[PDB]
Amino acid sequence: SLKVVSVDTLCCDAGWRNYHFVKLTTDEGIVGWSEFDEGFGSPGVTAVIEQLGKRLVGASVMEHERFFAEAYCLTRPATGGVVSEGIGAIENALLDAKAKTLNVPCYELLGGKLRDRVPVYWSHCPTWRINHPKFFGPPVTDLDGVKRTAEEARERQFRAIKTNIFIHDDGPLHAWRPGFAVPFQPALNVDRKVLRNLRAHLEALRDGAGPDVEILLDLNFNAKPEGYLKILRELADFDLFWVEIDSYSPQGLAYVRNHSPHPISSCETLFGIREFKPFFDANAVDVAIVDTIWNGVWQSMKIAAFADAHDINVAPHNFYGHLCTMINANFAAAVPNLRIMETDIDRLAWEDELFTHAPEYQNGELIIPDRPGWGTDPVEEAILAHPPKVMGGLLQ
Amino acid sequence: SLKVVSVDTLCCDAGWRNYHFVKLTTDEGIVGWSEFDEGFGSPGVTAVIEQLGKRLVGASVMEHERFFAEAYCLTRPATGGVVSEGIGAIENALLDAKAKTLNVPCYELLGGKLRDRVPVYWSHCPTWRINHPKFFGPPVTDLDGVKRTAEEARERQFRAIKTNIFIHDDGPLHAWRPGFAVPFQPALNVDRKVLRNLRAHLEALRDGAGPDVEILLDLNFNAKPEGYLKILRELADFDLFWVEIDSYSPQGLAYVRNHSPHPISSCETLFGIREFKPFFDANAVDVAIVDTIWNGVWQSMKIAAFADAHDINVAPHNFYGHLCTMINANFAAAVPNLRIMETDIDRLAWEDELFTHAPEYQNGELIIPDRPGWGTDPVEEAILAHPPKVMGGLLQ
Amino acid sequence: SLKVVSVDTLCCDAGWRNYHFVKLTTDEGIVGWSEFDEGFGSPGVTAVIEQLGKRLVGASVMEHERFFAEAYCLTRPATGGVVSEGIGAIENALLDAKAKTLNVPCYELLGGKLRDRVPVYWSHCPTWRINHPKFFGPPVTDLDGVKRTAEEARERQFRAIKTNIFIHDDGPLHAWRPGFAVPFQPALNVDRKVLRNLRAHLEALRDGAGPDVEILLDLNFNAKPEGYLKILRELADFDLFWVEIDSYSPQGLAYVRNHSPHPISSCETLFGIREFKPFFDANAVDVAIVDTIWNGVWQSMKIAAFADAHDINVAPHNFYGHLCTMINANFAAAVPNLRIMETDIDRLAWEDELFTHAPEYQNGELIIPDRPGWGTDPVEEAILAHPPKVMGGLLQ
Amino acid sequence: SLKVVSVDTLCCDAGWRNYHFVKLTTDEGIVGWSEFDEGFGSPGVTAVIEQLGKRLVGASVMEHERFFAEAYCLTRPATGGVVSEGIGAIENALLDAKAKTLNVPCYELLGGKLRDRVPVYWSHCPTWRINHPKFFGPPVTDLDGVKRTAEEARERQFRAIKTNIFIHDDGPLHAWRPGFAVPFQPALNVDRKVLRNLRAHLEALRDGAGPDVEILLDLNFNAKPEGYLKILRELADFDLFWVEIDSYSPQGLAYVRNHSPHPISSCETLFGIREFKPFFDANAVDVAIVDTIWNGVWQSMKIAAFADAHDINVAPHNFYGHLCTMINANFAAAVPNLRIMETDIDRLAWEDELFTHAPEYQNGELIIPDRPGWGTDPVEEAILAHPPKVMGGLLQ
Lengths: 396, 396, 396, 396
Ligand SMILES: [Cl-]
Ligand SMILES: [Cl-]
Ligand SMILES: [Cl-]
Ligand SMILES: [Cl-]
Ligand SMILES: [Cl-]
Ligand SMILES: [Cl-]
Ligand SMILES: [Cl-]
Ligand SMILES: [Cl-]
Ligand SMILES: [Mg+2]
Ligand SMILES: [Mg+2]
Ligand SMILES: [Mg+2]
Ligand SMILES: [Mg+2]
Ligand SMILES: [Mg+2]
Ligand SMILES: [Mg+2]
Ligand SMILES: [Mg+2]
Ligand SMILES: [Mg+2]
Prior knowledge:
This is part of a larger assembly, with 4 copies of chain A.
Chain A: E1 4-13, E2 18-26, E3 31-36, H1 45-56, H2 64-74, H3 81-101, E4 117-122, H4 127-131, H5 143-155, E5 160-163, E6 166-167, E7 174-175, H6 192-209, E8 214-218, H7 225-234, E9 242-244, H8 250-258, E10 264-266, H9 272-281, E11 287-290, H10 292-295, H11 297-309, E12 313-316, H12 322-334, E13 341-343, E14 361-362, E15 365-367, H13 380-385
Parallel strand pairs in A: 4-13, 5-8, 8-9, 9-10, 10-11, 11-12
Antiparallel strand pairs in A: 1-2, 2-3, 4-15, 6-7, 14-15
The complex binds chloride ion (8 copies) and magnesium ion (8 copies).
One chloride ion (CL) binds at residues 185-187 of chain D.
């Protein structure tokens, strides 16, 4: 019949956060999967999915843009954010199911592949070993550990690594994340302490990385334009692949970029061409980060094409489980204007148990798989062996 | 202690949709309430509230902007929409509790009152009698019914009424709501059928209203700029108080307004100064509609002040239960640049059972009450006597 | 009755200028106070207050925004400047009275507090010891004195200090203030003499401050854009927390900022969202200085929210007596987007006599008090023991 | 010596407001006069003048731009409004004294005259007979009176007349001035009542005026852009010389003008090229009204030249006593780009007692006099025979 028979959500432990999944079944017995997230400031996604999936049962699995168009109508007043995340999760499960029904990898739905491998950067490096050492080891607790982590990235043939903001000289090594209320300092002022610790951290990272490995810096939402300018001035003489700055002020981000000696990336939290547009119109970014897990991969192709017309290259936002990596891998395979792909190389001790297939890396690149669908399936029995905790992520 | 002890949510039947409430209790035994909504495209609000309320327990009931600042940080990546609705609901319960603790009406927190009564328009008139006749009677099923409803508004001393788009000459009278997928025609094209039915409907309404009662027209998201222009051209010779058009294109809405012979209102779905700004910068609106139930009343005061500096008057978005009306009444009491207040005069047969106090109208105005807090409390036993159904509203 | 019974003004000696106060009494016997200023280019404020206070008697002390709305109407043609200062002074006395009536600190009216302490900078350092040495000692008369003053700030645990423009090598040490006609050189040209003296002064200040204490530079209205650019170029290699530039040319100030290697602050003389708007639209400032004594604290909350939407942090303009400090402290307690707070640490020998309570500093921060109202009251008998002189300030 | 020996202010009764004067005496015994106003929203002007005049004593009477430059410096932070009015009043007394010293009319200082007579409009017609009938008769209390007043203007050979907004059908004839809080309705909404009364009033005025006399409409600050558009739409088919709209929103006023079928005038409350500039840049006005009493005539020549470069003609704001008329007459004599001159033809019963010379009109034009100085002097004994009341005007 090609009809959708069921849409369910599943959830499992990912240590300091949970992973979530959409499981969509068709009348032919094909199962389409996606992975989504609530911990990154996004309570409510499951509720959105459970409501929207009710309307989808009985509809054609093949008609994903019809579903999107309908869903957009039904939730139009509160579009974006958690609503749009729910829509994107369902879209990604629909794509998997459609690809599987047609016996093709998902990139065959997205224009075909135009590359077989994708260069990555090792993200949250050494952020995961510093911030979640119970889950990702060896723990990093000092500048020597920072250096050693970069040395490890170099030895393992990774070509780039991305860090965040860390305070080294005020007690135990800790992250500086005031944009997410750790600590609660909602003005997000940047003081000397922040600047000298950024410098110390990056110098240690460069010492370990050597001169060839690229270093990316993510500042998230942790300052105002004033403070971002202060950081960029301070770090004017560093060799940075990009400095990543999230902002809801296209004019402010454009001002910062205009005064930056480094490439600026942004946009990981934005939805649709509509939200990217003011940033591109303002010349606000060198690189547009696109969250295809949030937007849905079909919607993300639209965003990539929009960026292409502005001669802006895109990078997937990818810092979740293996299924998200494979979803992003398919997007990265199809998009011409691809900057690089993000991936976390630090993995949970049970990550591989949760999925049928793991991403394969060789010489600093992700190999794009050629199996029907995204390239990996969550394993239901494994999910049940790792029951979820209450919401973590930013809401820990 | 002035600490928040608990944050709970409650839900009850409102016929074709549910009402939702936040119940916040302090260490002193004061209870602060707000009303919120999920049916207007907003699945997930309850989940957001339940997560955010966990962080609020143990904090001061007096420190509402602290809570807002913290909440904004914790959900920054997925801000707006359902996340921001959850934050606004909690804010409104905090305000009620703080006012009650200080033994004052909520307007005493908002600058004091500057008026004792607020002119209203009777909204969803005759929309509720056409679209939900099982709940709001007498049913309206033809043009004569449309005329009679306007006559009733005139007799009852209402000074203004607001209708939507109705098809009268293609079978049983029915609403035209393609922007919300009823029917599913996602291009939102406007054809002759729409135009002639708008004309027929508005002529009947004017016939009943007489020449003094003002007629407002809400087009919601039911066209593209092209179609909005077609509608405004067609209705060029009508006397309309405003034409209300929701759009996520400030440039498109500005183009429409520039070519409109009628005042244009918009913005009921927008969050914060940030989202209103592009519209004001573009000269897109005569009147800014502010949803204080969604934004929170404190945040809405910021938006009202922003509008004031642009010499734009604001109107509350108010089409829910009595508590929402009283929340909006307090906002309307304090804001200098107030255009008018929306209210639905058609009420459910059990509306008055659900709340301790009902809004009072006299000579077409809402009387602003002077009780501690918002002016009415949901009644817990009554809520339990009207158990909720599954989600309705747009998601019916 | 909650009615205002009387509005009076009082005035006392502050050495080289006078302090002024609004005293508002209610029917319940509550007294609300504010402090205002005439010496900073503002003859006439008292006359404005005395006229506007006549209309206020008999009105509710609780309805401060009603009073503001009415006052704005009555003085609309000559709004801003001295008129708006009079309105702001009355607003601040109303707020004090309302807070006292409700038995809460003024920050309880402003959203609640979100911080308990506020970092400050020691302003007019060493400006007060150079320019008014009869009142603030020890006198500073040479570069060694400049260095020693910065050393004192460091020892006393202040984290930042702010100086102005001084000429050291042309006779007795003297201020360069041509923008205020000392000397009268109304072109405001910047020559070598100015540049080399700025350098000499700042080098001495840095020598005393050490590398951790932040140095702020205030240029007031003492140049044109051309000259501001010359100064910023000259000082390109200094580590400055901000350079403060007052301008009535948003396009000119924006040009300067675009070419500045230092953060730019401005706006201390501006009134309302309306006046700040062109500067924010032009990207003219890193930091917005808000004079809440001039604007009124309620109006200033509107300005702070406007700045927040532009991701601009604000700093109070505070260089008067203890009551102004406490007024600003309450604003600073409530505003999320707070850059820092200005305060003069050099005090008159009789400052503490004039007020019931003095501001308390610890480890470079101002402690926010928790008494009803602003946190301090002028003392009537002390005011009479220090009779005012003719107008001083800029009009000396 | 050519030194200024004294600067004094005088004040006398003008019925519902006072007139004020600056009296400046030189060492040679020449007396220069100006007239200024406080009632039009401007408490404090006298205080400003008394402070600034202290600095002027001992300076050259010939150096008026030196005084202006110095005064601007000394009051720079609170410039505009009442401060700038004080400066303008002194400037106008300086000009009179300088002209008298050189034995020439003031227009000889302003480029020489380029016309001998100036067409006027009869302003506040029938506004003064309606609003201040105790002082200006015969009283106007109905539509027939409105018609008769216009007939009188026609018979007396006036070519143009200007009215305001009046409510005729809700009790005794009364002005609609919500922008100045009469009545207090601070949203400034425009309803049917306003529109139908504007129409009725203007139809009566046109009936009396005949087809040749021009009719001007002043809306002051009595609406928001929304309401101004509503008024202009309603009055689309009237033949109006201009519609006068005061606004502090250049973008809003420009929007209104863009949609106006009538010429738009504004700017009567603005100070200096700086304040006019945003309006001209926005294409906001057909005609710029310049208050030379407020700005000073020398400053006003700068504004007129600025307007000239934009191909905008200017009109003096003139609705005070005979000295203001003569001050404006001299400006009007010298400015090439002169639209028309405002004057009130309704005069107080004692107006002529107060001044040595009265303005002379012939065939609808003001004759420019050729006496040294402005053309009339206040009479000190007459001033003392008409002692002032408390402040009236808007502050009544
Ligand atoms: Cl989580
Ligand atoms: Cl902070
Ligand atoms: Cl619902
Ligand atoms: Cl369609
Ligand atoms: Cl002073
Ligand atoms: Cl000079
Ligand atoms: Cl007066
Ligand atoms: Cl109003
Ligand atoms: Mg968004
Ligand atoms: Mg990132
Ligand atoms: Mg949005
Ligand atoms: Mg609507
Ligand atoms: Mg100004
Ligand atoms: Mg300053
Ligand atoms: Mg101004
Ligand atoms: Mg006028």
